[PDB]
Write a protein that binds this ligand. Sequence first.
Ligand SMILES: Nc1ncnc2c1ncn2[C@@H]1O[C@H](COP(=O)(O)OP(=O)(O)O)[C@@H](O)[C@H]1O
Ligand SMILES: [Mg+2]
Lengths: 98, 98, 64, 308, 56, 68
Amino acid sequence: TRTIIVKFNDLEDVINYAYHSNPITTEFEDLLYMVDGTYYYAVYFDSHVDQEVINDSYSQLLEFAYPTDRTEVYLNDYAKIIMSHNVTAQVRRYFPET
Amino acid sequence: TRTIIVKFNDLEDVINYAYHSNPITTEFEDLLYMVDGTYYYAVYFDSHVDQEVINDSYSQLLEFAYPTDRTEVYLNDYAKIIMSHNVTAQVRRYFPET
Amino acid sequence: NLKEIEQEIEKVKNEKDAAVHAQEFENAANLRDKQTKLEKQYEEAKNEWKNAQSTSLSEEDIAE
Amino acid sequence: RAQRVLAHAQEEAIRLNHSNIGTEHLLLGLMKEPEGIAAKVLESFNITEDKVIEEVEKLIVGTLHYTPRAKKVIELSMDEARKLHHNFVGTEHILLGLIRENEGVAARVFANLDLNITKARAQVVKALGNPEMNNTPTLDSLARDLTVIAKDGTLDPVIGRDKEITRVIEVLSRRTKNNPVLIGEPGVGKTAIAEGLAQAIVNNEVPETLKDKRVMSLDMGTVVAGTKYRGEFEERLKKVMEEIQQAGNVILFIDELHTLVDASNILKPALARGELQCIGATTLDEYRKNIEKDAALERRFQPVQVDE
Amino acid sequence: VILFIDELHTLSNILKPALARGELQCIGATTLDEYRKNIEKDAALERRFQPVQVDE
Amino acid sequence: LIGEPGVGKTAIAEGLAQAIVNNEVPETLKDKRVMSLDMGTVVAGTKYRGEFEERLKKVMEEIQQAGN
Ligand SMILES: Nc1ncnc2c1ncn2[C@@H]1O[C@H](COP(=O)(O)OP(=O)(O)O)[C@@H](O)[C@H]1O
Ligand SMILES: [Mg+2]
């Protein structure tokens, strides 16, 4: 699948990934969802990206967050979109480093 | 295998082997390890020494020593090298007769 | 009162092992010779003990 | 312990110029220390340093911190040290922690290099293992062993009860009625006498006769499980008895001996025959009211007074 | 873990593997009638259990 | 054997057994087995109905068959 989701317990973990992670030099589209305070990170890859970069990212998120416990359909239903197409840039611009 | 490891409960057994044993006129390299007071004896034969001679020497070792209770990897990690490349000779030259 | 030899035997053996653990072989041989001497003295003490190792039941032992 | 891998982690982070310290860095450090058990075990699976370096480079300042997954891996490795390896943690514990947490860049490298997880765990266990690969089950369950506690050193010391301990020692050395009874008010130290006897046994103070005899406190809490079934408690009493018989090195401490004097007809032949040696603790009033009345119990037990 | 067992009187030698040496910390509760009858009459329970009277 | 405690009744039974072993008894008791039975052992583990009677009956039948 080209749609992954990971689970950030707190916005501190999101800030940690935005600052201290150097993701693979790849192009992708990022959306941030929130339900009951839990942050869900959804990134969508175009038709030219390999699943190896996807597992590497899912591990860096896994190095900063947890695997998703909610399906994509459930998040598209009940989760409020918080950020789209720019996650790291906007948290870096607003939030400072830990 | 090319590595023979035997365990000496005490130093007296090491001296007993050093003086009272008559190994086959073979070429080998020997080291003496020590963990928790227990002594371990390792002998490495050349590539040209046959396996039957290895087993023969191992069974000659068992007269004065017990079969090893720790693997070679654990010994190389944790055990301290007490003597190198000449165990019988150095034990004989340092400690006197029983 | 023979206990005053076992403790020094234990101390000498522990010092023996600690000394050989540090690749100090001359001190090791000296300590081993001392340990052998102390072990022989302890064996001699045990020998005098078993030589001292008869008691009879008297009328007073029963009166008590 | 081997902290040089943790020391590597920063150095390899600078060398690769990464902004974090991940599980792949820890794997690179395990490679950096060839002496390690983890390095040898992973080398046995043809997983060597240059291949790991190439895989990490294919896969993946100053504010470098261990990623939450790296911290989780370290915590798991400490928890894996609960394999009776005390506080000290080694490289193979770290490798086992990485194996258990099959998530992260290290897990991705293992999958990419086709390394089996269960086989690696078995290899580590065998490397840590031993290459070369009587008892009273019921008594050890319903009774409290005092000699093992004394050997462990957890038993509290006994002070000043030298005369009582010597009296117990000389009573136990008799041929016919070698069963002492400790008579005293509650809370004076009657159980402390048995504990001190166990300490003397451990400290090699007892004579040659009691040199290697265990002191097992037969707690009489619920040995009488059911008072209505015929023989339900008699059966387990007989079982405890023949277990004590088959291993003739068990001294038995029975607190509140007067509660058992239902079991008189079973304990009487064994005590009179010499298969069981017993130490009892009772009160003077209870002793006079129960044990002194029966002449059969007097022909077995010898009173010892424990004073406040 | 601190173990709580209500109706303690419904429960010694069932649980000495953690009560003889105090491995289980019993924090149970019972009435005075069910305490004097079977808890006060036991030697092992007197060694470990301490009566905490609960007031009206 | 009737007597005060500690007079030697069990000693009397043991002496009879020793006389059997040393063979100083009449011919009718030359090779008899003196077997000491404790009733607490017989009653041990007898919760269900009829088990004690069954055990005692088997013991008696064995005594009758052996005859010694
Ligand atoms: N002589 C002694 N030396 C050390 N501790 C003692 C001594 N006598 C009693 N104690 C302590 O005081 C407590 C008293 O309990 P104890 O008198 O043994 O109960 P019981 O008399 O019912 O056997 C024990 O837990 C023991 O630790
Ligand atoms: Mg009798």
